[PDB]
Amino acid sequence: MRIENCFFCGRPAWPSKGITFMRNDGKAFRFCRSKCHKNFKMKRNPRKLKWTKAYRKNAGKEMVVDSTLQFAARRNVPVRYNRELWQKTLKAMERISEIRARRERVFYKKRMAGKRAREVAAARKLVAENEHLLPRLRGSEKRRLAELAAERGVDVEELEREELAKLASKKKSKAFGGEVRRV
Amino acid sequence: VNLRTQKRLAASVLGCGEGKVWLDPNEVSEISNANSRQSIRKLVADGLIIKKPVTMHSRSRARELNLARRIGRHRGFGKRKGTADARMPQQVLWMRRQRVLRRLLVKYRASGKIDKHLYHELYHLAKGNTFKHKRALVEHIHRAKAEKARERQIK
Amino acid sequence: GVFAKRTMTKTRRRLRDLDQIERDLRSPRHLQQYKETKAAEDLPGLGLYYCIECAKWFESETSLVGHRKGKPHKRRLKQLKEGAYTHEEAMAAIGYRIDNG
Amino acid sequence: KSLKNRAIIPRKAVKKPLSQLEDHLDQLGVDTEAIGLRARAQT
RNA sequence: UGAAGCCAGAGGAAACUCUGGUGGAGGCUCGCAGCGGUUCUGACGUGCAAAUCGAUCGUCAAAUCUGAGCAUGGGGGCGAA
RNA sequence: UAAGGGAAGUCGGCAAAAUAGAUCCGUAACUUCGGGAAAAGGAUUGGCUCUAAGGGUUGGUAACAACCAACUUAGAACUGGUACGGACAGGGGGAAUCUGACUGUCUAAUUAAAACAUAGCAUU
RNA sequence: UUAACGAGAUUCCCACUGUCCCUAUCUACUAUCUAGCGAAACCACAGCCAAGGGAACGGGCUUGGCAAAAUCAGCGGGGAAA
RNA sequence: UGUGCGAAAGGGUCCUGUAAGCAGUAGAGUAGCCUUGUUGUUACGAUCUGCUGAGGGUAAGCCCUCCUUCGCCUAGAUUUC
Ligand SMILES: [Zn+2]
C-alpha cells in the first residue's frame, strides 16, 4: 500500500479514506474527505481557499525551496530489492525528518520576525493615549498613607509604591447589581 | 398595592401612553395615596412620576442610502423590480418635455429671436415629436436661422 | 438565477471543468473530441456558435456576442487568466515530484 | 444599554446615591473629605 | 395591453398608404383589500363551530360589494329556474 | 432534506418538485384580423468608483458663464463569489380532442356544470 | 375541422421531482409522566379457545385443550362502534 | 477517604475557515492644495496583502490530567423469614 495525498487540500489520504472521482478524459481525483469532494463539486478553487496547502504554497507560507524536499519522489524506475539499501533508507528518512523540522521552524520565525516591534509600537501609542486608566491609589488610601508617613517619619512616595504593588498583586473583579433588602 | 388607576391618571396628565409612564418602585405607598389628578401632578413635580422618552427610530441609514442612490448606486437590473413605466412613466416624461419646449418657444418669441410663423411651425413640430430636448430645439432654430440668413444674403 | 438550484450539485448536472477548458483552448484536438462527444443537430444553433471559455453553445452570433459583454464570461476569463488548478500544482503544493530517470 | 426596545432614562431624572458617587471618586483618586460631599448632597 | 380622436414626417393627381409620437377605450387582463367557494386519501368529526380552520383557487371598475328605510305573505310571495 | 435512477408508483403524475420580478434578443399554427402572446426558445441581474444625457433662475452667437434641485436612463473600469429578483415576493410550458360563444348566475349545509341567463334570431 | 374565453371532461410530450426502487434523518405541537381540573357514547349478564349442539346460529350446553393476583403503553382480529 | 464524585481549567482530538484592530509606493477612479506634476501631494475608495491554519466552538452520549484549582463525603426516610 501507499499514502496518497488529497487533490484538493493536500492532506495525507490513507486507505479507505475519502473518495475518488473518475473523469471521462482519463484523470482521477482522490479526495481525503467529503469537504474537499463537495468543494470540488461546487467548483471552488483550492488556491483561493485559505485552509489548503495549495493556498499556503501560493502565499509562500510553506517552505518550498529546501534540500530536504528533494528526497521524496514518485519513483517510476524500480530498484531491485536490497536489505541494506532499505535499512539505510529508513535511517535517512529519520534524519531528513529531523532536519526538515528544524529548517521549517527557522522559516516560520523568519516569517514572524517583525511582530515584537509592531506590538511595542502599538502598546506605546495605546499607553500614550490612555495614561489616565493606569492603576491608581484611592484618595482615602492616599490620605491614610500620608498620615501614616507623618506618624512614622517615612516616605509617602515609598508607601505609595508598595501600596501600588499590593493592589497590583490583588486583582478583584466587580459584580453587577446588588441585593435589595427586604422589609 | 395596585397602581393601575395611578398609571392611567399619570398617562392622562403627562399626555403620553401608559407604556411611557414611570412610577418610582421605592415610593409605591406614596404613589398609592395619590387618587386625584392634583396629587398625580404633585408627584410629577416632585419627580416620583416621569415620562419615559421615545424609543429610537433613526433615519441615518435611509439618508446614506438616499445619497448612494443619488450618486448612482443600487440602480442595476438586480435592484429593479417594477417595469420601466411603473418606475418612470412615459406620460410624465412627455408632459415635462412638452412643457419645457413650449416654455422655450414662448421665451424666444417674446425676446424676438423667432417670429410668429416660425413659432407656430416649431410648436407643431414639437407636438409632432421632432425635438427630443431643449438643445435639439435650439439647434433646429439655429439651423433654420442660418438657412434664412443664407436666403436673405442670396436675395 | 440558476435553474433548479436544488439538484445543481448532482453528477447528472455536471459542467465542464476549467482545466479541460484550458486544454481545449491550447489544443484543438481536445475540443474536437469534446464536440464529437455531442450531437450537432441537437445543439443550440446547430453547434455553429460556441464559447470555448464558457464551454457553452448559443443560438445565434448575436446571442454569443451578447453573452461576451456579461459578467459570467468575464469571470471565466479572469479564472483562465489566473490558471486552473491541476495535478502538477497539487503536487508542487506538497513539494512532491516525479522521478522518471 | 437596551436601545433596541426602549430608551435610556436621562441621568438628570435619577437621584445619584452619595455612597456610590463617593466610591467612584475614590476610585478616580480624589479626596472626598477635602471637598465635603455631605454638605452638597441633598436629603 | 393599448380602441376612437389628434400631431409630425415620407409618399400618392387625389382618395388613401407607411413610419414615429400623443391619447386613454374595453360588461379587456395580472393582481392587494373586499366578495365568492375550486381542489386536497387536508385539519376537525361527542369540533372553536348544528358547516369552523389551513393551503390552494375564482372574480376584482362591473350583470361589483354593502348599510338603513320601504314593498311583496303560504291556495301566497320571490325565483339569471 | 435525501446518494444513484427519474413515473418503473397509482384507476389516474394525486401530492410534491420545477417556473416565477425586471432589462434585452426573439416569438408558430390558427383567427371573428380584435387576438393567440408573458406563446415557444434564449442573454443577463451583486458591490464599488466613475462618465454621459434629461431642468429652473440671474447676468449682457447668451449658439455663453455662474448658482440652485431631484429623480430616472444609458455607458465603462475595478472587485467578491458556492449563490447576486441571494430573505421575502413570485406564470411550469407545450401538442390535441370533446364541450358551452364570451363577461355573468344557482342547488346557504354533499353536485358550479354541456344547467340558467345573455346579446343575436324567429313566431304569435 | 367555428377564433377567443373556461376552478368544465380526456390523451400525450419536455422539464421536474421521495410517486416508486427503499427507505433514512431532523424540528415544532401532541401522544407520554406529573399538579390542578374533568365529560360523554355505550352498558340483559358477561367476556380464552377447539369439535359437537338437524331448523347451515352460539358466549352460557356436551366433550376436550387448559387455567394464577393487580397492572402500564400500544393495537385494530373478534365483541361493541354509522 | 477513594485509582472517589462534581464544577472549572489545561492539554489533546475534531468542525469552520483566517477574528477585532492597525498598517501598506496594492487598489479602478474622483476632488482639492501647491512644486502644476516628475509614486506631484493630500483626501475618499468595493476589494487585496501582512500581522493570522488565525479567531471561534469542542460533550451536551469525545479522550487524558493523585502530581492545575475549588468544593462534597461515613447521610436522611421507609421496609424486611
Ligand atoms: Zn482533502
Q: Which of residues 41-100 of C touch strand F (CB under 7 A)?
A: 44, 54, 56, 58-60, 62-63, 66-67, 69-75, 78
Cell digits for B70? 443619488
Within its chain, how far is the Cα of C92 from the centroid?
Answer: 24
Structure-block grid coordinates of residue B76:
442595476
* Residue that has been written with the C-alpha cell 424666444 in this structure: B108
**Is C100 annotated to bind ligand?**
no
A182 secondary structure, DSSP code: P
C-alpha cell at C5: 438550484
For residue B1, the Cα-to-chain-centroid distance in whole angstroms is 51
A120 Cβ contacts chain H strand, under 7 Å: no
How remote is the CA of residue B9 from the centroid of ligand 1, in Å? Answer: 71
Element (H, E) at B146: helix B134-154
**Residue in C101, C89, C19, C84 with CA at minimum distance from that of residue A64:** C89
- Give which of A142, A138, A134, A139 is closest to A159, Cα–Cα: A142
Q: How far is the CA of B113 from the C1' of E10 (A)?
A: 30
Place of cell 474537499: A36
**Physical contact, D and C (3 or more Cβ pairs within 8 A):** no
What three-state secondary structure class fits C57? strand
C-alpha cell belonging to residue D6:
426602549
Distance A10 CA to ligand 1 centre (A): 6
Map grid coordinates 506605546 to a residue.
A124
Amino acid A142 reads K
Residue B7 CB contacts under 8 Å (≥ 6 apart), including other chains: B18, B21, B23
Give the C-alpha separation, D13 to D9, whole Å. Answer: 7
| CB contact (8 A) between residue D32 and residue A136 | no
Q: Which of residues 5-44 of A touch strand H (CB under 7 A)?
A: 33, 35
Q: Write the single-letter amino acid at A35.
A: K
CA-nearest residue to A136 within chain D is: D29
Count of Cβ atoms closer than 10 Å to residue A101 Cβ: 11
Amino acid at A54: A
Nearby residues of B124 by Cβ (< 8 Å), 6 or more positions away:
none
**Residues in contact with B64: Cβ distance below 8 Å, sequence separation at least 6, in sequence order:** none
Interface of A with D (CB under 8 A): 136-140, 142-143
Joined grid coordinates for residue B41: 401632578
Cβ(C99)–Cβ(A73) below 8 Å: yes
Output B108-115 pairs: Cβ under 8 A, ≥24 positions apart: B108/B141, B113/B141, B114/B141
**Residue type, position A82, single letter:** N
B131 and B139 Cβ atoms separated by less than 8 Å: no
Residue D33 with chain A: CB contacts under 8 Å: 140, 143
Q: Which residues, in sequence order, are bridge partners of residue B49?
A: B23
Alpha helix stretches (DSSP H) within chain A: 34-41, 53-59, 83-111, 115-129, 139-152, 156-169
Cross-chain Cβ contact A75/C99 below 8 Å: yes
φ/ψ of residue C98, rounded to 5: -120, 130
Residue A36 Cα to ligand 1 midpoint, Å, equals: 5
Q: Are B50 and D13 in contact (CB under 8 A)?
A: yes
Measured CA to CA, the distance from residue A135 to residue A168 in angstroms comes to 8
Angle at A172 between CA A171 and CA A175, to 5 degrees: 155
User: Which subunits sit against B, judged by 3+ Cβ pairs under 8 A?
Assistant: D
Sequence-separated (6 or more) residues with CB below 8 Å from residue B22: B49, B50, B51, B52, D9
Outline where B82-129 has alpha helix (H): 84-87, 90-111, 116-127
| Under 8 Å between Cβ of A73 and A57 | no
For B51, the closest chain D residue by CA position comes to D9
Radius of gyration for chain A, computed over Cα atoms and rounded to the nearest angstrom: 32
Report the candidate in A55, A26, A31, A51 with the shortest Cα–Cα distance to residue A41. A31
CA pair distance B19, B52, nearest whole angstrom: 8
Report yes or no on chains C and A touching (3+ CB pairs under 8 A): yes
Residues in chain D: 43
Q: What is the spatial distance between Cα A60 and Cα D36, in angstroms, rounded to a whole number?
A: 66
Alpha carbon B107 to its chain's center = 29
Cβ distance D30 to A139 under 8 Å? yes
Q: Is A11 left (phi over 0), alpha (psi -120 to 50) or beta?
A: beta
Contact A14, A6 (CB under 8 A): no
The whole-angstrom separation of Cα A32 and Cα A14 is 8
Rg (CA), chain D: 14
CA-to-C1' span, A33 to E77 (A): 85
3 state DSSP class of B95: helix
